[PDB]
Design a protein around this ligand. Sequence first.
Ligand SMILES: C/C=C\c1cc2ccc(N(CC)CC)cc2oc1=O
Length: 133
Amino acid sequence: TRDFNGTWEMESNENFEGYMKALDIDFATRKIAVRLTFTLVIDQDGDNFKCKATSTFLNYDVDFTVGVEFDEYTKSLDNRHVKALVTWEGDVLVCVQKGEKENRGWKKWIEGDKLYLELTCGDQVCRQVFKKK
Ligand SMILES: C/C=C\c1cc2ccc(N(CC)CC)cc2oc1=O
């Protein structure tokens, strides 16, 4: 199933601290954000995605079409410009964010009814798991 539509509530968050530190998020912001539980609202229509991640402190939005490279300004996080491209590797949705940081991107997939989001930057990998609400 390649269907990420819906509202998703975080159940687990592994190594979010490492990912944020790899992005150079300022200490105070990072210390608060590592504590947070996130909710995702995903609108998926063909290749068109509108994504909205929310918490009490850090909110992140991205819109894209699969297979269409786009400029992303990561102003809610590290405030960098990346050239982002989201494509399918099987049923895994894969984003590569080309720019200053090496190995920067994310992957997302459904397994056992749960949504998995893997965030990478540098040598850090963060794994988040969400249940469908
Ligand atoms: C799956 C597509 C939409 C979607 C992509 C997405 C990408 C990244 C992201 N984060 C890292 C900057 C915050 C946890 C959250 C996201 O949330 C989404 O809903």
